[PDB]
Amino acid sequence: RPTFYRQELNKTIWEVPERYQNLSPVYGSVCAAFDTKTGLRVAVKKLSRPFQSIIHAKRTYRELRLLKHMKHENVIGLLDVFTPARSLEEFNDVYLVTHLMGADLNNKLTDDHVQFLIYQILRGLKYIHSADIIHRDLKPSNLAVNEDCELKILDATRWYRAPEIMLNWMHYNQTVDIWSVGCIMAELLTGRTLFPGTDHIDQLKLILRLVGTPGAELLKKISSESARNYIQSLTQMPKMNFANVFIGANPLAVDLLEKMLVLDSDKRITAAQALAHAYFAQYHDPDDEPVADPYDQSFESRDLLIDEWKSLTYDEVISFVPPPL
Ligand SMILES: Cc1nn(-c2cccc(Cl)c2)c2c1NS(=O)(=O)c1ccccc1-2
């Protein structure tokens, strides 16, 4: 339907429609560009070798499904998806289009700013979690921020992982993301990484030091004996007073962190509960914190061939409906 034009860039090729102009660089690579149909600055990502293997093909499929489903102000939204190919037979390259944002949280703020940024992260997690989706990798690099201070969640790394991910607990839940948020918030109030471990052992040592080693009430819920010994085989440590670690920060912020950085995931506060915490007194509006439509994750359990994952992805591309301007 539209007209495409080839181009070299990032030591890579791009055949995009002609409505996207002025490509400029910025897993797969992202480019800045100008979208003529709406006159917004957009970001265009080209997946690298989307169907090189079964795991890749499934991930490409998973990423398109997730992006096609996200419709919320604090979560990355798909503006367009396209491929140059004319036929499923010819289909080997995938590009995704989103609102360009500029900086990351990666790039010391005031308590008012922190509130607004964490608030928006929780509003987006509430949404994402209502669909049974766990992000798993929230970090400053994955939080895009515009000049207006508006934020969207997008898709070391160990520094923000919940301890039940570090130990490969097979049955972790949604509140792994709340832990990440907890480390992020801390990093914004102190300008310092909360847990800058050097490896999966150092990392945990640092966590336990702040949160204290587990109580017998938590130890009784750990199914792995390796895990258990490894843990029980460590020098007991107590919970520190968060009011003395986060010295002079808002005592409401501190309260919120105590509730996010709990070791036991079963007692960690949720996104929806945190949004009603006092720390967000001035942003919190339960009439404007929506939840998502249900998300069919049934494919996560299937074992298909590359040619099958590739064709389901093609279908998803073809059946894309842009949002309204
Ligand atoms: C990590 C990242 N940055 N990143 C990105 C990089 C710079 C600006 C913006 Cl808005 C996003 C993206 C990504 N991945 S993504 O699935 O959220 C995505 C889809 C489409 C276009 C870019 C991204």
UniProtKB/Swiss-Prot annotation:
Highest rank taxon of the organism: Eukaryota
Positions that bind ATP: K45
Localization per record: Cytoplasm; Nucleus
Resulting phenotype, K45R: Loss of kinase activity
Outcome of substituting W309R: Loss of kinase activity
Recorded catalytic activity of this chain's protein: L-seryl-[protein] + ATP = O-phospho-L-seryl-[protein] + ADP + H(+); L-threonyl-[protein] + ATP = O-phospho-L-threonyl-[protein] + ADP + H(+)
Main location: cytoplasm
Residue positions, PTM Phosphotyrosine: Y295
Subunit architecture: Component of a signaling complex containing at least AKAP13, PKN1, MAPK14, ZAK and MAP2K3. Within this complex, AKAP13 interacts directly with PKN1, which in turn recruits MAPK14, MAP2K3 and ZAK. Binds to a kinase interaction motif within the protein tyrosine phosphatase, PTPRR. This interaction retains MAPK14 in the cytoplasm and prevents nuclear accumulation. Interacts with SPAG9 and GADD45A. Interacts with CDC25B, CDC25C, DUSP1, DUSP10, DUSP16, NP60, SUPT20H and TAB1. Interacts with casein kinase II subunits CSNK2A1 and CSNK2B. Interacts with PPM1D.
Family from the record: Belongs to the protein kinase superfamily. CMGC Ser/Thr protein kinase family. MAP kinase subfamily.
Protein's name according to its UniProt entry: Mitogen-activated protein kinase 14
Organism: Homo sapiens
Gene symbol of the encoding locus: MAPK14
